[PDB]
Amino acid sequence: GVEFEDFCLGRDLLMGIFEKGWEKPSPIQEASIGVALTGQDILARAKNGTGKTGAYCIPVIEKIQPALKAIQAMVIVPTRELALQTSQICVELSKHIQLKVMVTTGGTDLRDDIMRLNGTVHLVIATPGRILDLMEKGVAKMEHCKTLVLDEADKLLSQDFQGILDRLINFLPKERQVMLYSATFPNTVTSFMQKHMHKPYEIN
Amino acid sequence: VEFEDFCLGRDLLMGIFEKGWEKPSPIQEASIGVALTGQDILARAKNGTGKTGAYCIPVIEKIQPALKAIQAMVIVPTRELALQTSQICVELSKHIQLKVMVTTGGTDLRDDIMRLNGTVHLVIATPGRILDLMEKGVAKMEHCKTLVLDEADKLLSQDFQGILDRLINFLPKERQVMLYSATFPNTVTSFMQKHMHKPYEIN
């Protein structure tokens, strides 16, 4: 049976995993974590549960350098509810790392977010509209953001979002890892992945 | 850049050090991390003990010594390469309770049978001899989840009877295949198409 120690995670992260009660990796975690740690793009068909979240949160947190005071990874979700669920898991998993997590879902005085970004932020969890606004204003600087997670990609690429995911991803460095998770794969998703991703590892 | 940077146990790291391999060669840097994730691998590489180490290191890392069953197999075209490779595996695994067996021409089948009655974790084979032992039911492959084909172009060239093609159907259908070859003629790419799954390509 595959163990979390089999991935060679930092001890601080391992303690957060153990202390959250995750003794052994779930199927989607075992399927994805090892490849995700290599840096290869990831294309995963997954339903909108929460084992999905651990599957991408663990590798995202592992490769963040907390001594580097810059945004190094970003998770994009379609809703506030999902942003809060994902943020809770990241905060829990990174309990023993000095990792600064920022959540924004808009609906607030933009100065709340500007205030936070003037400080140290390692990991951004966001709905796409507000964080794109912060990127276009130059408040969220993306030079070091080498990892992007798109969670519920079919929703994020729907008509609702009016093409802003394409504007968002164009701010990221060209050398970067994209992890895409989605329940369905219509033309919006497949055309996006062909344009922006590089020979991703596919996961059923 | 360093062997320590890959996810390898201290026991194997010691065997790599005592072999005198200071840092991974470029084929090793490019291979080891992906190999450890379980992905099929397609690697263009010319001959050397560096490509040998590129597949021997992750193969050894993933063997569970407490499981007394064949867990990986390496196929090479000559007895002499099998002997060189098994010796490297024994040296790399000096600090691990790992049992390595060679199955090639030049040994009595009665000897192979008696050895396979004991514990064998890793087989280094030429194709004809191991296929014979698998057919006889003596080399039991239920747990052999990793197969390496070294110098595939030579393995698949004169295989007019389809030995390799028949051999691979004795392995678990859920399996990792690592293929290394200097050239990629029709026989090699046809094998890849038929038996491998979306392999990670290395040049």
For B4, which residue in chain A has the nearest alpha carbon?
A: A8
Edge to edge, the sheet with strand B122-125 lists B100-103, B122-125, B72-75, B146-150, B176-181, B41-44, B200-202
Task: Give the integer Cα–Cα distance in Å for A32 and A55.
Answer: 6
Overall residue count recorded for chain A in this entry: 204
Does the CB of B10 have a partner CB in chain A at under 8 Å?
no
Q: Kindly report the nearest CA distance between residue B100 and chain A, in angstroms.
A: 23
A53 annotated binding-site participant = yes
User: Which one, of B65, B72, B82, B75, lies nearest residue B36 by Cα?
Assistant: B72
Q: Kindly report the nearest CA distance between residue B174 and chain A, in angstroms.
A: 13
3 state SS for chain A: CCCHHHHCCCHHHHHHHHHCCCCCCCHHHHHHHHHHHHCCCEEEECCCCCHHHHHHHHHHHHCCCCCCCCCCEEEECCCHHHHHHHHHHHHHHCCCCCCCEEEECCCCCHHHHHHHHHCCCCEEEECHHHHHHHHHCCCCCCCCCCEEEEECHHHHCCHHHCCHHHHHHCCCCCCCEEEEEECCCCHHHHHHHHHHCCCCEEEC
Does the CB of B34 have a partner CB in chain A at under 8 Å?
yes
Residue among A7, A8, A38 whose CB faces B34 most closely: A38
Q: Work out whether strand A101-104 and strand B122-125 pair parallel, antiparallel, or are unpaired.
A: unpaired
Sign, CA dihedral B42-B48-B49-B50, equals negative
Beta carbon pairs, A and B, within 8 Å:
15
User: Which one, of A137, A195, A128, lies nearest residue A168 by Cα?
Assistant: A128
Q: Where are the alpha helices (DSSP H) in B94-202?
A: 109-117, 127-135, 152-157, 163-168, 186-195
Q: Collapse the DSSP code of B101 into the 3-class scheme (helix H, G, I; strand E, B; otherwise coil) and give the result.
A: strand
User: Which residue bears the tokens 């080399």?
Assistant: B139
Task: Give the integer Cα–Cα distance in Å for B147 and B78.
Answer: 17
- Structural domain total, chain A: 1
Mutate one of A2, A14, A38 to test the B interface: name it (highest B CB count within 10 A): A38
CB contact under 8 A, A35 and B36: no
Task: Give the integer Cα–Cα distance in Å for B197 and B179.
Answer: 12
According to DSSP, the residues that pair with A202 across neighbouring strands are A43
CA B98 remoteness from chain centre: 14
Task: Give the integer Cα–Cα distance in Å for B36 and B24.
Answer: 15
Q: Collapse the DSSP code of B17 into the 3-class scheme (helix H, G, I; strand E, B; otherwise coil) and give the result.
A: helix
A49 annotated binding-site participant = yes
Does the CB of B198 have a partner CB in chain A at under 8 Å?
yes
Resolution of the determined structure in angstroms stands at 1.8
A67 annotated binding-site participant = no
B-chain residues near A8 (CB < 8 A) = 7
For B31, which residue in chain A has the nearest alpha carbon?
A: A38
What range does the domain containing A111 cover? 1-204
Q: Render the burial of B99-127: b for 16+ CB within 10 Å, e for the rest.
A: bbbbbbeeeeeeebeebbeeebbbbbbbb
Mutate one of B13, B29, B36 to test the A interface: name it (highest A CB count within 10 A): B36
B9 annotated binding-site participant = no
A185, with CB counted inside 10 A (0-12, 13-18, 19+), is middle
Task: Give the integer Cα–Cα distance in Å for A102 and A120.
Answer: 9
For residue B193, the number of C-alpha atoms closer than 13 Å in the C-beta half-sphere is: 7
- For residue A15, the one-letter residue type is M
| Distance in angstroms between the alpha carbons of the first and the last residue of chain A | 20
Q: Collapse the DSSP code of B70 into the 3-class scheme (helix H, G, I; strand E, B; otherwise coil) and give the result.
A: coil
- For residue B138, the one-letter residue type is V
Structural method: X-ray
Which residues, at least 6 apart from B50, have a Cβ–Cβ distance to it below 8 Å? B25, B27, B28
